[PDB]
Amino acid sequence: MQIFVKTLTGKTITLEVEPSDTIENVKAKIQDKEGIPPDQQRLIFAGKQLEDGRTLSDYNIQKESTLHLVLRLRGG
Amino acid sequence: GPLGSSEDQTAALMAHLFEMGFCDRQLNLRLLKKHNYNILQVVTELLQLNNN
Structure with a gap:
């Protein structure tokens, strides 16, 4: 099932995920195209955080759902 | 240099x-x-308030 990822840059990425797709693997599907590290990748769903050890079904994520991607950069 | 940043950005x-x-x-x-x-x-700060 295809879902959409909204970035702070105003970009909407489309991904093909399965009901048994772990959040950690979702980050991998972004990492290959964006190049952004999964550890820095933070997905927000309805104002809630998505645990890497959880599945899409855990957060009732269905088809055409929009996930927000925010990164917390560290300097020093 | 610049005169002032667009405060309208806050709305976006x-x-x-x-x-x-x-x-x-x-x-x-x-x-x-x-x-x-x-x-x-x-x-990310707001998420730390309600992540449970």
Whole structure:
């Protein structure tokens, strides 16, 4: 099932995920195209955080759902 | 150099936060001033308040 990822840059990425797709693997599907590290990748769903050890079904994520991607950069 | 930054940008940032799941312009405003307009920190800071 295809879902959409909204970035702070105003970009909407489309991904093909399965009901048994772990959040950690979702980050991998972004990492290959964006190049952004999964550890820095933070997905927000309805104002809630998505645990890497959880599945899409855990957060009732269905088809055409929009996930927000925010990164917390560290300097020093 | 510049004369002044467009404060209207704050509205665009606010909208991006409302699309997630907060809908609190007050909390957003007090957070933006906390990190000198840092959307990346605001969203992640707010998430630390309600992540359970």
